[PDB]
C-alpha cells in the first residue's frame, strides 16, 4: 500500500444503470476499483442507489446520494467529498454538487450522457409501437445483456429498459435546465464548458472522460469496434462487447458520431475533458465484464487510479 491516490477528501464512486453497486447481485459494479484505490491511500466509498430510477425529486437518486454523502461525512469527519460517477451516476453527482455545493470538492463524470443518448431515443421511439421493444434485434440484444446485470430485481428486462428513460435527449435537456452547470458547453456545440464552477462561495473542480470504441465507417452508415482487434476473445467472453457495437451502430445512424455504445463523445463532455480517445465501450469504462476488455482497450483501473492522483495533486 502507498499514498499515490491519497486525496484530502474521500472519494465516492457513483454507479448508474438499473440499481445498486452490484452486477447480478454478485460482483461489484466498479470491478476491482474500490480495492485498487484503497491500496493506494484513498478513502473510497461506494454509493448503493436503489429504488427510484430518476435522479430528480424527493427520494430520487440525487436525494439518495445526498443522504449518503452526509452519512459518510458524519462517520469520517471529512468536510467534503470527491464524486466520480459513471453513466447516469454522473448526473446523480451533479445533483449533489448543485443542492449541497459546500459538501463537494470535485465532480468527475465517466461516460455520462449529459446531452442524452441516441440509443435511449431509439428505444423510446420503438416502444411507441412495441412496448416490449423485442421487435428490434438490437434492443433484444441490449436487454439480454444488461438485463442479466440488474441486481435486487425480480423483473430485470423491464428495469434494464426503464434505466434508459432518464438518458433520452428530452429528459436530459430538462435535467440540465433544472440543474444548470458551468461545466456544460453551449447546447449543440459539441464543446465542453468550464473546468471549474463557483456555486455560492464554493469552488468545484469538474472533469470527465468517455469511451469512443465505436467508430463510424462508410455510407446507412457503418460502424466498427476499435477496442478489439480484427478478431478478439472479448467478443466471446464478454457478451456486452458485440451488444454495445450494435447499439453504437444504431446511434451512429442517428448522427451520434463516435460513441461507447450508449453515449456519444459530444454528449459525454463536461468540465475539463481528460480524454475521449479511450478505445472503450460503455462497460469497459468500469472494468466490466469481470475485467474483460478488447486488446486495444486501455486499463480502466489505471485510468481511474491516475485520476485520483490528479485529484490529490489539485489539493482535493
Amino acid at each position: 500500500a502507498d499514498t499515490y491516490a491519497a486525496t484530502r477528501y474521500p472519494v465516492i464512486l457513483v454507479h448508474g444503470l438499473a440499481g445498486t453497486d452490484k452486477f447480478a447481485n454478485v460482483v461489484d459494479y466498479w470491478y476491482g476499483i474500490q480495492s485498487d484505490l484503497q491500496s493506494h491511500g484513498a478513502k473510497v466509498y461506494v454509493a448503493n442507489l436503489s429504488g427510484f430510477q430518476s435522479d430528480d425529486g424527493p427520494n430520487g437518486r440525487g436525494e439518495q446520494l445526498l443522504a449518503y454523502v452526509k452519512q459518510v461525512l458524519a462517520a469520517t469527519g471529512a468536510t467534503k467529498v470527491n464524486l466520480i460517477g459513471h453513466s447516469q451516476g454522473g448526473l446523480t453527482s451533479r445533483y449533489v454538487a448543485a443542492v449541497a455545493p459546500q459538501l463537494v470538492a470535485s465532480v468527475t463524470t465517466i461516460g455520462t450522457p449529459h446531452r442524452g443518448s441516441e440509443f435511449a431515443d431509439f428505444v423510446q421511439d420503438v416502444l411507441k409501437t412495441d412496448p416490449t421493444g423485442l421487435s428490434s434485434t438490437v434492443i433484444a440484444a441490449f436487454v439480454n445483456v444488461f438485463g442479466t446485470l440488474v441486481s435486487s430485481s425480480h423483473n430485470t428486462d423491464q428495469d434494464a429498459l426503464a434505466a434508459l428513460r432518464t438518458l433520452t435527449t428530452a429528459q436530459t435537456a430538462t435535467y440540465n435546465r433544472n440543474f444548470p452547470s458551468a461545466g456544460l458547453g453551449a447546447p449543440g456545440s459539441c464543446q465542453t464548458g468550464a473546468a471549474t464552477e463557483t456555486v455560492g462561495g464554493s469552488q468545484h473542480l469538474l472533469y470527465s472522460w468517455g469511451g469512443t470504441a465505436i467508430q463510424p465507417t462508410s455510407t446507412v452508415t457503418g460502424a466498427t469496434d476499435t477496442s478489439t482487434g480484427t478478431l478478439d476473445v472479448a467478443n466471446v467472453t464478454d457478451p456486452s462487447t458485440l451488444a454495445l457495437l450494435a447499439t453504437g451502430a444504431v446511434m451512429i445512424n442517428r448522427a451520434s458520431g463516435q460513441n461507447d455504445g450508449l453515449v456519444s463523445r459530444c454528449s459525454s463532455l463536461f468540465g475539463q475533458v481528460i480524454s475521449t480517445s479511450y478505445h472503450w465501450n460503455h462497460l469497459d469504462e468500469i472494468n466490466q465484464l469481470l475485467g474483460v476488455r478488447g486488446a486495444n482497450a486501455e486499463d480502466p483501473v489505471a485510468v481511474i487510479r491516475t485520476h485520483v492522483n490528479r485529484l490529490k495533486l489539485q489539493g482535493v
Binding site: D2, Y4, A24, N25, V26, Q34, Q38, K43, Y45, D56, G57, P58, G60, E63, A67, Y68, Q71, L73, A74, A75, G77, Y95, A98, V99, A100, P101, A141, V145, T148, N178, V199, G200, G201, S202, G229, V233, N235, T237, P239, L242, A243, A246, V273, I274, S277, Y278, H279, L289, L290, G291, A295, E298, D299, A302, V303, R305, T306, N309, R310, Q314
Partner: protein, 270 residues
C-alpha cells in the same frame, strides 16, 4: 497559442507512480512495476506507437537515469509489449466456462512473454477474476447447496484480500449504522446516544447535527410548501404560476443550493 498541458490529456495533471526498488539495487518484483507501465499506456490512444515508446523510455529515465534498474526496467518493457503483440461471437448469453478458459490462455502468454514477471503482473488479477467467476457459476446453476458452495469458495481467499475486504466492510458499516438510525426515525438525541457507544462521541456529534439539519430542512420546506400552495391556488396561467413560485423559492431559500433543492422536492411527492 500555447498549449494548456505539456502531456497528453490522459496523463496531464498526474505524476507517474514510483518504480519499486529492491535491496539488490534491482526492480522489486511487485505489481507496482506493471502499474508504472499501465500508467503511460493510458495514453496509447492519443499517441503513435513510436511516441508511446519514447515516452516510456523518458519516464523510466526520469526515475532510474544511470542505474542497473533502468536497463532492467527497459527489459520488462520489451517483454510487456511482446505480451500485447502476442495477445492478438454470436450475441448469446454469458458462460463462466469460456471466460475461465480465456484466463487460462492469457495466463499462458504471460508466462511465455513476461515469464518471471507473469506472477507480479497478473498474479492478483488472475485470482480475483477466477474467484469471482466461480461465485457467478455457483449462483447460476439445480442447486438449492449454493450457500454451502459459496461459504467454502469464500475460504480460498488470500490473507491480503480477506483483510482488504474486512477493512472496506468496516468502513462502510460505520456509514450503515448512521443510515439505519435515520430509517428508524431516530431523534438527534437518540442518534447521538447510539452512535456515541459505537463510533465514538465525535462521530455522534456530527450525526446528531446531521439529524438536526435534516429536521430543520423538513420544517422549512413544509412551511414553504404551504406558501407555494397558496400561489398555486390563485389560478394563474402555468407560466405565471411557475414564475411566482420560483420567486418565492428564491426568497425563501437563500443558502446556496437550497432553492434548487426545493425545486427538486416540488417535482415529486413531498
Amino acid at each position: 497559442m500555447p498549449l494548456p498541458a505539456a502531456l497528453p490529456g490522459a496523463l496531464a495533471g498526474s505524476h507517474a507512480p514510483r518504480l519499486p526498488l529492491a535491496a539488490g539495487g534491482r526492480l522489486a518484483r511487485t505489481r507496482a512495476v506493471r502499474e508504472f507501465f499501465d500508467y503511460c499506456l493510458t495514453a496509447q490512444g492519443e499517441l503513435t506507437p513510436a511516441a508511446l515508446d519514447a515516452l516510456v523510455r523518458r519516464e523510466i529515465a526520469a526515475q532510474l537515469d544511470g542505474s542497473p534498474a533502468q536497463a532492467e526496467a527497459l527489459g520488462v518493457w520489451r517483454r510487456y509489449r511482446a505480451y500485447f503483440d502476442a495477445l492478438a461471437v454470436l450475441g448469446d448469453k454469458l458462460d463462466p466456462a469460456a471466460m475461465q478458459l480465456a484466463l487460462d490462455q492469457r495466463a499462458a502468454l504471460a508466462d511465455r512473454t513476461l515469464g518471471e514477471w507473469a506472477e507480479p503482473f497478473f498474479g492478483d488479477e488472475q485470482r480475483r477474476q477466477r474467484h469471482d467467476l466461480e461465485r457467478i457459476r455457483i449462483a447460476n446453476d439445480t442447486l438449492s447447496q449454493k450457500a454451502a458452495r459459496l461459504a467454502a469458495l469464500d475460504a480460498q481467499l488470500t490473507p491480503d484480500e480477506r483483510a482488504q475486504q474486512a477493512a472496506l466492510h468496516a468502513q462502510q458499516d460505520a456509514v450503515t449504522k448512521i443510515a439505519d438510525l435515520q430509517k428508524a426515525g431516530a431523534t438527534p438525541d437518540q442518534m447521538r446516544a447510539q452512535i456515541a457507544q459505537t463510533l465514538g462521541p465525535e462521530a455522534a456529534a456530527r450525526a446528531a447535527q446531521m439529524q438536526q439539519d435534516d429536521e430543520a430542512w423538513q420544517t422549512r420546506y413544509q412551511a414553504y410548501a404551504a406558501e407555494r400552495d397558496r400561489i398555486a391556488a390563485q389560478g394563474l396561467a402555468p407560466q405565471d404560476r411557475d414564475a411566482r413560485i420560483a420567486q418565492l423559492r428564491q426568497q425563501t431559500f437563500t443558502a446556496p443550493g437550497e432553492a434548487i433543492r426545493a425545486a427538486s422536492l416540488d417535482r415529486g411527492a413531498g
